[PDB]
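#dry-run=false #mode=assembly
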Amino acid sequence: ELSRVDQRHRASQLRKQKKEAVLAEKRQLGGKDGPPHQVLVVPLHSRISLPEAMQLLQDGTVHLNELGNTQNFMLLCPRLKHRWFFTSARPGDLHVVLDMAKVADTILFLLDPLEGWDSTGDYCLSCLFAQGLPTYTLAVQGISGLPLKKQIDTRKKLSKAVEKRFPHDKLLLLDTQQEAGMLLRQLANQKQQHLAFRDRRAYLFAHAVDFVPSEENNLVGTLKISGYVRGQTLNVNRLLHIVGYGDFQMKQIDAPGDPFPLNPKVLMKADPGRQESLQAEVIPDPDEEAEAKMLEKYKQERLEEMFPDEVDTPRDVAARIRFQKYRGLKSFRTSPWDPKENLPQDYARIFQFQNFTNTRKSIFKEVEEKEVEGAEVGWYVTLHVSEVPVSVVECFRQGTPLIAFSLLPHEQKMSVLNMVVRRDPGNTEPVKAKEELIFHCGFRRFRASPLFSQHTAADKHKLQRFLTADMALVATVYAPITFPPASVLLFKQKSNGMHSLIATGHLMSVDPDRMVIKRVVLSGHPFKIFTKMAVVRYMFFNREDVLWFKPVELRTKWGRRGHIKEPLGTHGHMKCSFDGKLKSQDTVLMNLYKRVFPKWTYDPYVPEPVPWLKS
RNA sequence: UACCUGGUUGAUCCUGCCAGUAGCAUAUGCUUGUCUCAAAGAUUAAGCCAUGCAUGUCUAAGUACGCACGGCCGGUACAGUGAAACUGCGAAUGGCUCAUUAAAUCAGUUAUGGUUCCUUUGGUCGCUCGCACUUGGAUAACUGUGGUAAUUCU
RNA sequence: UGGUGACUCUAGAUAACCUCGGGCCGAUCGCACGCCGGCGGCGACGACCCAUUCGAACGUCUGCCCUAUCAACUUUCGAUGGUAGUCGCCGUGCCUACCAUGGUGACCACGGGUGACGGGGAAUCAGGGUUCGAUUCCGGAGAGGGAGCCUGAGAAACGGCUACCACAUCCAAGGAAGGCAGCAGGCGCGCAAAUUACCCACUCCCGACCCGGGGAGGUAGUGACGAAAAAUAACAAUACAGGACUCUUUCGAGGCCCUGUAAUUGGAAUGAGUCCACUUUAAAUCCUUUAACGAGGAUCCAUUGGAGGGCAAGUCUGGUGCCAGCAGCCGCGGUAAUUCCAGCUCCAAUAGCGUAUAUUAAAGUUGCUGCAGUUAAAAAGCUCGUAGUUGGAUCUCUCUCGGCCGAAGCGUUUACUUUGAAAAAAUUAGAGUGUUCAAAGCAGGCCGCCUGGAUACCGCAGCUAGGAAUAAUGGAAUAGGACCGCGGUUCUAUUUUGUUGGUUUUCGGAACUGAGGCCAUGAUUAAGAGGGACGGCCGGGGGCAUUCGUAUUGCGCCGCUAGAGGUGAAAUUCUUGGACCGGCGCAAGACGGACCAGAGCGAAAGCAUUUGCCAAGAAUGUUUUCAUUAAUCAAGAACGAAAGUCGGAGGUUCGAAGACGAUCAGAUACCGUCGUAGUUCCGACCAUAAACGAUGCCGACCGGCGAUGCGGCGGCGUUAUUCCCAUGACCCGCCGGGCAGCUUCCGGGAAACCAAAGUCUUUGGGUUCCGGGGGGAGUAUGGUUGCAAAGCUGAAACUUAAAGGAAUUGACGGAAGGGCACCACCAGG
RNA sequence: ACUACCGAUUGGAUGGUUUAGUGAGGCCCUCGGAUCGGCCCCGCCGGGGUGCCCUGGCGGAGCGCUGAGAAGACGGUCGAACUUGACUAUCUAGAGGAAGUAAAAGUCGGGUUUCCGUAGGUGAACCUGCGGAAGGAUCAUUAACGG
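#status=ok
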C-alpha cells in the first residue's frame, strides 16, 4: 500500500467505520429514542435479602409499580440521561426467572461474602447459562459488614469461589448509595451481548394488562397488553405468542402516551382479514412400585451400555412375526433408505419445507432488509387481543410477568424439531427414550415424547434408548416450528412438582426427513466351528426363521463378517459362512433395523414449578 | 559443558532440509499452602472520554480600617491574630506517551575569539558639576444597585 | 595597563551622539535602640552592569537499518559560492538585491521503505557473532490535526490564548464551553495489561516560606510478568518380603547383617490456620516476637504433561475396532491396538507444569574466524575494459636565546603498536560485609570509638608521548641539486649620530640575480613479472581475388529399351512420345571425402582444393630495450554455432509447413512418394545452445613412464644415383611451451574418480562470478534492448517431506546355457 | 445452495502531491479618534503684598491647545483552511458474466536412448526441420618395405 500517509489514512478510515458501527449500536438502548434499560436482580445465596440491596439501589425519580408477590419499579435520571427498569427474581422459582430473564437487558447477581452462592442459586445459574446470558454483572453485599482484616481476605476467597463458574469478572460491591452510583454507571456502559433469539422477532414487555370479557360465562375476552416493544417493528398480521400460554391471534394495536418520558388513545392498526396469518397448527384435510420401576430402569441402562442393543429372541413368539417390520442392512453408513417409504398418519398432519435454508434466508432478509408499517421499537404501545383465557390476568395478579412476542411467518404450524442437546452432569437419573419431558425450546414450554439419536453427519441416525452422560444427542419430536438458533432446555417432574434439569443445547434445523433408525441385535453362541464355517445355536428357534432372514449379513463382536448358508435342525441350528475362523470365546450377532417415529404428545400448558431444592 | 538425535533406500555412504533439544519473551490452559522482591493499556486505536483530583504560595520584615475575632486604654497615627483583595514569585520543573523523525535524533569529541541567561554567589551601588523632615493620580478588598437560561461572565 | 596560540580583546585618549514606545545613579520595609539641635549598628527587598552558577542555543570531526523492480540528483519558487544589506540573541542564503554556474554521486548521491525516537543497555553466546531496546537513567519530540501568538529570563506553552479542520457538551435556540500521549475510571480496540483507595511521614521540588501545597513521590489493593528462599512429614519397635553371611547334602534355622513395604503400634517436634498482646506505620497491612487452641495419614490428601522410536517410564488389564481418534516428525488404528479411551502401575519436572507465536544457541544450513560451485543447488559463451580489490626483490636529530640543561625547528606525510588523560550513574565483571541462608541491599563493627561506600571494562573517532619492523607516499636526471664563501637590483634598519628641523647617521633583515669552489656531485637491478624489438620458422588462424576436383540436377545427341522408382511386405509416382540405363558434351549451384591422427591453430563460436596478395598470431633463440608498465574485474565494449527476422541475388541436393499412399478392436505415431519458407551468398537485427573439460582467471610447491606437435641445442651412424663444402629426410638424447595417454598407498574425496578436483578443523597467495530442501518458476508484474519472435534483470501467494548424488547386491528375466533322474526318455520287457 | 474473480453503476466517500483561485486569525506598519485627563477663558467668590501676582471650589462653551487612548480600516507578513481539473492512493453497496464445489448409480457412450537451442504444426505435451551433446555398453590387426 506504500506511502506511510496512505497506510495511515486507510487505517483511519477503518477506525471511523468501526466507530460508526459501535455508535449506531449503542443508541438503541436507554435514551430519549431508546426504550428503558431492564435490569433483573437475582440474589443467588439464601442469606441475602433482596429488599436491602433493592432499597440501596432505588436511590433519581422513582415510580414504584406493584404486583401480587414481586415488586418491580421504574427509575428515571437526567443526571446520567438513563431510564432503568429494575425487576427482582428469586432463585429456585425457575418459572419467573426463566420467562422474564429472556427479555431482561442486564442481569445483576448478588453474592454473599462468606460463601460463593447457594445450591438453589447454583441450579438457577446453571439453567441461565444453559438458556442464554443477556449480560451478567457480579455484585456482593456483606463486604463492608466486616472489618478490613477479614475484608480483603473475604474478597480473595470470593474471587477463588467465582472463577470455577464465571471465568473472570471483577466483584463490584454494594454497601452505600455512592457504590450504587458506581454500579449504575457500570450498567449504563457495558459491552452489550446481542442475544439474537430476542432480536429476530418482535418481543414486547407488558406493564399493563386489562381484561375485557366479551362473555364472562365463555371465560374469554379482550386483553390489553400495553408495554414496550423491544425487538423489531411489530406487525399486527403476524401472530402473537405468550410465553406460558401459547400462540394465538391479536386483533388491534393502539399507541397511547408514554408513562415515563425522559424529558417531560390513537389506534395504530386493525388486522385486515385477508392479510392476517391464519390459526392453523395442523393440516385441515386429514410408592414402592415406582422404586421397583426405577431399579428396572437402572438395570436396563446398565444392560444397554456394556452391550449396545442386545435383545434376547423370545422362544415363545415366532421370530419373523415379532420383527415383522425390520429389515437388514449390509452397512449402516452406505446402504440407502427411502425417507418416503413408510409413513403414518402423523406425518400427514404436519408441514414440510421444500428448502429450509432458502426459506430461512428469505424470512430473515424480509425482516432485516425490509421495513413494515408497524410500530417501531421503544414505543409504549397497547395490544388488544380478541381471544385469551381469563386466568392469565389472574396470573398477572399472582406475581409472574407477561411477555408477548410477535412471531415470524410459518411459526405456528407443527413440524419435526431436532434439538442438539447434552446431559447436564448435575442430574444422573436414567431417562428412557420415549419418556415425557418438558422442553423449554426458546419462549415455548411443553411436554413432549422425544427420540434420542446420534449427532453425526450421515443420513440415518441410530436411535438411542437412553440418555448418555457425555455423548451429545439429538432429541427429535413433533413440535411447533421455531427458527434456529434457539436455546433448548430439558426438565422432568422429580417429585411434588419440582422441575429438575437434565440436559440442554441448541435447536438444529427443523425437518421431518431426518429419519431415526431403531436397531435390534440378536445374539448367538457358535457351538461348532469349522474353518470359515460355523454351526450356531440359540439365535432362532424355528426352522423357517433362518429362511426368512437369509440375506441379512452377520457380524461378530471380534470383527468377523459372514452370511448364512443353510439351516440344519428343526430347532435354531444354523450354518454360517465366515471370512475367518472364530475364537472359542466368541459370539455372532445379527443387526435388524426399523424406522421409528416419535409419539404425538404435545400440550402447550405447563404446570407451575415449585421452588427448587436439593435432595 | 566449543554436544547432538530421528526421518529419503532392498541395504550403504552422502548432500540436504524437515522434526526433535535448550533458552528467552508475550498470550493462554490447568493447578496453587508459606515467605521476601517485583513488571503491569507499549504492540491493536498518538482512537474517544462521564466524574473527582493532579499548581500553588507569608515572613519581625510590600499593602490590613473585613469587631472577623479574645483584646488593649481610651482623643493614644498604626496594640495582636487575620478571611478577602492588590502586589511579587511559580505555573517553562515534574508526570505522560513514541506518532513523527535515516546524518535527522542521538553518542563520544571539540568550539562560542559567533551568542542569550531568572535565580544563586562575589564585585559595582555619594565616579556624574547639572516638597526631599516625603510628590501625584487612580483601582481592587468593602458598601450599595443590577443584567443574562447559563460560565472562574461581568 | 593586563592577557590568549591567535583580537577588530580588555584598558586608555579625543570628537560627538544618548531614542518621549526613554538606561542606571534606592520617594521601600523590619529589628533592637544609642552617642555629641546632629550623627548611627544588624537585617530584608531592590537595582544599570560585571563575573559566576544552572543552563539554552547554534556550529566541528567521526559513527545509522533495508532497498537499484531508486542512477543521476539540485537549481524558474536558493540550488553551491562572492559583495552589501534586512531580520535575528548571535555566525551563516536565514531572507532580499546584483553577480558567478556552481554543489552531490557506484567510497551507492537522490528517491523510497522502516512492524525506526536514539543511546546507556537486554537475551543468548567457547572465539567470532546473532537478535532486541515502546519501557522507570540521559538526550529528543508531541499534547486530536495544522497554524499564529500573549506574558515572561526562559514557551511558538496547550491542566494559557486566537483561528480553520475533525469530533463533541448545555440550552430558554439569543448564545456558552471544550482537549485524560497526568492519577484513578469508562467505552472502543483487541491474544494482550491493576484501585474512580490512603498520605505528604520518607525522597525531593515550588512559594512571600523552621509553618503552606504536591495523583512528583510514598503506601496499601489487583498481580502464577519474572526472580530468591522454602513446607506437604522425622525417629524407634514390630509384621512380612527380598538380598547377601554363617550353620545345614538340601529343605530349612539364626544374626545385636543389609534393603525395601506396611489406612501396623509407640511416643515426642513442628508449621499452615483461628486468635490475643506488642512491634511496624502518617494511620494501618505485611514480615519479625509472645501467650491460647491447633496433625495420624482411610487427611491440614500436589499438580501438570507423558509411557511405540527421538525420549525416562508397561509388549499389564478392559472398552472402541483404518471408526472414533492419536501423532511436532517417523508413523499407529483394518481384532492379541506396545500409539486411541479408561483403570492399575510407572516416568519427567515439581507449587508449578502444558500449548501457541516471536526471536536466540544448535546452523561450519549465511560461513570474518569458517561453507560450497565435475556428477547432488550452483562457473558468466568468450575476450577486452574503467571505478574497486590486490600487487616482486631492494637502503643500518640539531643551530640560535636564557638557567650540563630549559625554550625553537624537528622528521615527507600517514596507516600500525604502546603509553598517558579524558570519557554520567544504574546495568555488567568484581572487593568487603551471616540480609537467618539466598535474590537483594550498602551497610555496618567494638564498648562514645573503629571503619566501608573500592576496582576492571567503557569499543571506534579525536588529543598525547615513545617505538620504526611491516604497508603506502616523497625528496637531484630539460639540473632554475644541496653546502660554503665572492657580488649586484629593490624594499626595509625601530636604535649609536646629548636636545634637535634635517640631505645623509651607521648596523642588520627580507624578495630577483652573475660567476667560483665544493659533493667519491646526483640514475638500486633487469623478476624462471610484463610490454616492445630483432632471427628463422610454424599452423584446417582470418580476409580478398584466383584455380581445380568430383558428385547431383537440368538440357542437347546416339543406342537398347519395357518397365523404372520404393519397402519387413506393399502401395503413391515417372515412362513406350519413350523412362531407368551406357556414352559424348554443355550449364547450374553445392561441398571440399578418402589423406584426417586422441594431431594442429584460434578468446570461444569454430577452421581441410591450388596459387598470389593482405595484415595478424603463439612458441622458440637472444650477454637487445623500456623498468613495475602487472592479476582479476561493477560500469561499458567487440566476437558469438544452428535456427529465426528485415532488404537484394541465386536456387543443385535436402527439406520445416502442406499434399499422397500403406497399417489396423481403436493409429491419428510408424514407413516410403512430392514439396514451400529455409538450407547458399551480400548488408543489417537477433545474442541463445548439452555454447560441456558438465571443472573461472593469475601464481607457487608436489611422483614416475614413454609417445606426439612446434622451436632450439648436442650428436655414432643411414639416404640426395658414394653428393665436391654446407644442407633437407631417419636414429639416440637434453631444454622450453603445448595437445593428449599409461600407472602410483602424493594426498584428497560420499564415492565414481582426480597429478589436481592435491598442498582443507595442521582450516588465510590475489581476485571475479555464483548456490542455499523440492515445486510454483526462470512464472506474473515492472524496467530495458529488440521490426518481430524473443533476450537481460526477475518475485510472491500457495504447496510437499523429501527431491537428489555416487557406488553394492539381485527378488526377477517374459535372458541364455549346461547338468541330473526307468518315480523321465531311447531300445525294449 | 456455498465460495471467489471480472464487471455494467464517473457507484459514493476520504487523504497526499498538486495547477489555478480564494483566504480565517495573530503580528508589524500607516491611519483613525469613542472617550479620559490636563493647560487655558469666563461667572460667583475668600487671602496675603499694594483694582493688580498667585491660591481653594463649582459650572459653561470656545471642533483654542495638549498627554494617554478603544472600536474600526487600507497595506505588508506568517498562514490554518475552502473551491476547481490532473496524478493518484484507499474505503465501501451492487444488477449481471465466466467458473468451481456437495446433492441426481437420472439420458447417451502399441511405441519410446535422454535431452539443449531455435521455427512450424493448434496454446502447452508430442512430432518434425537445422546445429549440438552423453548425463549412452570397443571385439580383430598394425616389426619387412629391399635387388
